[PDB]
Ligand binder design. Structure first.
Ligand SMILES: COc1ccc(CC(=O)Nc2cn([C@H]3C[C@@H](O)C3)cn2)cc1
Length: 290
């Protein structure tokens, strides 16, 4: 750990804390996450091989005095801060589209390697001056676990959790990441979180109030899920034109497919990349004031 010079606290992610730091030998500026079971060590070691331009590179894994440090490529800003800074005028549609397109490329890559994120949220989406956006922390939830409260007692957000996770499916799939990304896509467009639940049942019921309480017609097998209760209120579905208003029919169609209830009907990252919404995708440069 002696090999790095801490510059500043970046934040309190899930898993421990994150600092901006400089490698004393290379001069490289990195992000150091302070998180150990052998199982976690081996799984974390395989993430070092998962390199893609839209995945935050894990540079090195350091285990000493049996604490764990993950060294990552550094990016100057996250999407949560960028959305907050863009709130008065909104992120231009072409930039929303580029960001969605790149995040689906990242997801398609990890998913083809059978690696899931499981806890996607705007804070783990990092951006640079060039117009790139990258996913951070892929594979970590499978390596260690995802808390109720962070290490700082901060409340882990439920806003982006897929309904099969909320209903107790133990063996959820790559579709949970598509759901979280859909929720993010909608938030970029409207400038308000889609489903801002403050409890697991509030999260589920906000989903139901917008997309309709799921049943056996739209989601075969849903009434047999572990946490499904027949006493759930039955709400009617709303139209997407009311849910993410400004967005055109190509975008609403894609969003609807990223938000299908049945994990098996939900679009894959690979199929989402071919959706007609990306017919005019481009790569604009964002306005970043660092
Ligand atoms: C000025 O204070 C900050 C500087 C940068 C940022 C954006 C950020 O979070 N940058 C980052 C984080 N990471 C790694 C840690 C692993 O979870 C992903 C790499 N770059 C936030 C705050």
């Amino acid at each position: 750990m002696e090999n790095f010079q801490k510059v500043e606290k970046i934040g309190e992610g899930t898993y421990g804390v994150v600092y901006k730091a400089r490698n004393k030998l290379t001069g490289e500026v990195v992000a150091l996450k302070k998180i150990v079971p052998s199982t976690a060590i081996r799984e974390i070691s395989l993430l070092k091989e998962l390199n893609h331009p839209n995945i935050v590179k894990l540079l090195d894994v350091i285990h000493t005095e049996n604490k764990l440090y993950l060294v990552f490529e550094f990016l100057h800003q996250d999407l949560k801060k960028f959305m907050d800074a863009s709130a008065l005028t909104g992120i231009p549609l072409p930039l929303i589209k580029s960001y969605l397109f790149q995040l689906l490329q990242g997801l398609a890559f990890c998913h083809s390697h059978r690696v899931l994120h499981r806890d996607l949220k705007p804070q783990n989406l990092l951006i640079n001056t060039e117009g790139a956006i990258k996913l951070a922390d892929f594979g970590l939830a499978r390596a260690f676990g995802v808390p109720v409260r962070t290490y700082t007692h901060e409340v882990v957000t439920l806003w982006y959790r897929a309904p099969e996770i909320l209903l107790g499916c133990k063996y959820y799939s790559t579709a949970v990441d598509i759901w979280s990304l859909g929720c993010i896509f909608a938030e970029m467009v409207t400038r308000r979180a889609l489903f801002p639940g403050d409890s697991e049942i509030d999260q589920l019921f906000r989903i139901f109030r917008t997309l309709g309480t799921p049943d056996e017609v739209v989601w075969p097998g849903v009434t047999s899920m572990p946490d499904y209760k027949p006493s759930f209120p039955k709400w009617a579905r709303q139209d997407f034109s009311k849910v993410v208003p400004p967005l055109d029919e190509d975008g609403r169609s894609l969003l609807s497919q990223m938000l299908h209830y049945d994990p098996n009907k939900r679009i894959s990252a690979k199929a989402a990349l071919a959706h007609p919404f990306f017919q005019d995708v481009t790569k604009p440069v964002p306005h970043l004031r660092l």
